[PDB]
Amino acid sequence: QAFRKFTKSERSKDLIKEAILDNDFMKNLELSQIQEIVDCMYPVEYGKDSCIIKEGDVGSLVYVMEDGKVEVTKEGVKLCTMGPGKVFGELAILYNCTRTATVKTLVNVKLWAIDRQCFQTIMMRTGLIKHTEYMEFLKSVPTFQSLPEEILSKLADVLEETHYENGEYIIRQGARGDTFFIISKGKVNVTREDSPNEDPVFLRTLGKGDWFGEKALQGEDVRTANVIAAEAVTCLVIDRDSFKHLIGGLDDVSNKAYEDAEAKAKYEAEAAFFANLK
Amino acid sequence: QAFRKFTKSERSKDLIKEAILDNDFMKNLELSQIQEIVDCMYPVEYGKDSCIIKEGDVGSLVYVMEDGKVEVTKEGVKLCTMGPGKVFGELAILYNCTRTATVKTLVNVKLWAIDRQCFQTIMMRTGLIKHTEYMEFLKSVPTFQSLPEEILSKLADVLEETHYENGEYIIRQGARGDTFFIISKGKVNVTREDSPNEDPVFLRTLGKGDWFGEKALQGEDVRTANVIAAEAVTCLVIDRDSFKHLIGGLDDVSNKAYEDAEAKAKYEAEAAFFANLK
Ligand SMILES: Nc1ncnc2c1ncn2[C@@H]1O[C@@H]2COP(=O)(O)O[C@H]2[C@H]1O
Ligand SMILES: Nc1ncnc2c1ncn2[C@@H]1O[C@@H]2COP(=O)(O)O[C@H]2[C@H]1O
């Protein structure tokens, strides 16, 4: 399914969009999401001296002022007035829907609104978009393309995107590591120092699609070589424990697979029975 | 189940017994079973020359007379009388057919009754009772005591109790067996015909708790030795195909099958990951 779009003027569309990009909470949303919210919102008007949001209320609507002026007050304390181009009523959505302040109108106003559902949903599409971009990325790299679909997709739901600047060491020869890295952007150099005062030896170079620190996923072990960024570098990463988890979460028994075990079992039970006798 | 006890006169309580002991379908019940029957029976004094059961009726009650006389007529043809004893009306309940005869009284009677359900239950209690006995018996033999509870209980639902007499061949060498025997009473001698026209060689004696003929459960076609009862013998018996059917449906076998399956899945998945790197 999908949501009911309310076709509006480009003027209003642009306005709604600026107000969002100007809101502490929503300025982070992905374009696709912002355009969605922009299309979901419908017009709402309130007369002068009308209470729109009352603190304590359990609310669902998020608004965008288009015209008029409102006044925000909390526990009786006037906080500010707001005019066109401002978002309000978005905060309750991340406090279990309990309004944190009162919003009364000073003149007749014209708002653009969206309900809790269209809102909470749209917001939710954040993890989905990530998974997509990640999946898209993983499937562009030969090695990870070959991986079965269950892990590849479950890997994409927990991976974190950490960053590095030219010159920073990502991992060092001799450290107690537990993080696996997949280069999504940049390039790095791997070096290892022979043993004593032997200047660091250059081993290989990795870049987009390459990876390193695999061993950390297979129990406690010290790194065999250093890995330093050789320019701006981005890495999708996952720590050992989280991995062990992902793996121990591959709840995917195949139809025929359960059948074969369904068989293996019977055989054993019978043989086990006769065993117990003589 | 827990039913109601219509406490009658000690005279009457000891009156029904005889009537029950006189029935082909009830002269086998356990002391307890009878006790109950006598207990849930309730007084149903009827009028003189009154009717009770009509051929074609759908049964629901079973009775035993106490102080009356009736005519178990039928096609109008007085097919006999019946005094304060003989149990009647049971036949319809057991075959669930339709009243066969058409009883009618001959004077102010004083018969007793019990509904289709209290009777139905008490009767079938023979099954649960034997299960228990069988269950108890197996648990008192170490080699079967160690078996899981599901197997012992399924086993008690199918095992049959059979008897032989001093000197009888239970198993004859070279025959085709389909049964496995567990000795619950007596002793047996196991001999083996070594070569033709030769004195069968003694192998061993088995007693309460021991067992013989397991091979048959594995499909062995021909028995390799004679098994002669050395005195009165009672055995619990089960046939190959019933055994194999039993085993194959154990819930403790499917649960251990799925787990073994989900564990291979998690393993296979991990190795697939590290096999993909290099
Ligand atoms: N200073 C402020 N304190 C609290 N809420 C404010 C303030 N300025 C604007 N608001 C808005 O007022 C809204 C009242 O309801 P919400 O808690 O849903 O969301 C709140 C914000 O969007
Ligand atoms: N000779 C008889 N033939 C048939 N039923 C009889 C006879 N004598 C007694 N009865 C009882 O009368 C009952 C009539 O109905 P039912 O078939 O339920 O069960 C029958 C027996 O319990």
Curated annotation (Swiss-Prot), chains A, B:
It is found in: Cytoplasm. Residues 25-142 are annotated as: cGMP-binding, high affinity. Residues 143-263 are annotated as: cGMP-binding, low affinity. Autophosphorylation increases kinase activity. 65 kDa monomer is produced by proteolytic cleavage. 3',5'-cyclic AMP binds at residues 89-92, 99-100. Transmembrane segments: none annotated. 3',5'-cyclic GMP 2 binds at residues 204, 213-216, 223-224, 258. It comes from the Eukaryota. High concentrations are detected in various smooth muscle: lung, rumen, trachea, aorta, uterus and stomach. Isoform alpha is expressed predominantly in heart, cerebellum and lung, whereas the beta isoform is expressed in high concentrations in trachea, aorta, stomach and uterus. 3',5'-cyclic GMP 1 binds at residues 89-92, 99-100. Belongs to the protein kinase superfamily. AGC Ser/Thr protein kinase family. cGMP subfamily. Isoform alpha: parallel homodimer or heterodimer and also heterotetramer. Interacts directly with PPP1R12A. Non-covalent dimer of dimer of PRKG1-PRKG1 and PPP1R12A-PPP1R12A. This interaction targets PRKG1 to stress fibers to mediate smooth muscle cell relaxation and vasodilation in responses to rises in cGMP. Isoform beta: antiparallel homodimer. Part of cGMP kinase signaling complex at least composed of ACTA2/alpha-actin, CNN1/calponin H1, PLN/phospholamban, PRKG1 and ITPR1. Interacts with IRAG1. Forms a stable complex with ITPR1, IRAG1, and isoform beta of PRKG1. Composed of an N-terminal leucine-zipper domain followed by an autoinhibitory domain, which mediate homodimer formation and inhibit kinase activity, respectively. Next, two cGMP-binding domains are followed by the catalytic domain at the C-terminus. Binding of cGMP to cGMP-binding domains results in a conformational change that activates kinase activity by removing the autoinhibitory domain from the catalytic cleft leaving the catalytic domain free to phosphorylate downstream substrates. Serine/threonine protein kinase that acts as a key mediator of the nitric oxide (NO)/cGMP signaling pathway. GMP binding activates PRKG1, which phosphorylates serines and threonines on many cellular proteins. Numerous protein targets for PRKG1 phosphorylation are implicated in modulating cellular calcium, but the contribution of each of these targets may vary substantially among cell types. This is cGMP-dependent protein kinase 1. It comes from Bos taurus. The lineage of its organism: Eukaryota, Metazoa, Chordata, Craniata, Vertebrata. The chain holds residues 79 to 356 of 671 of the full protein.
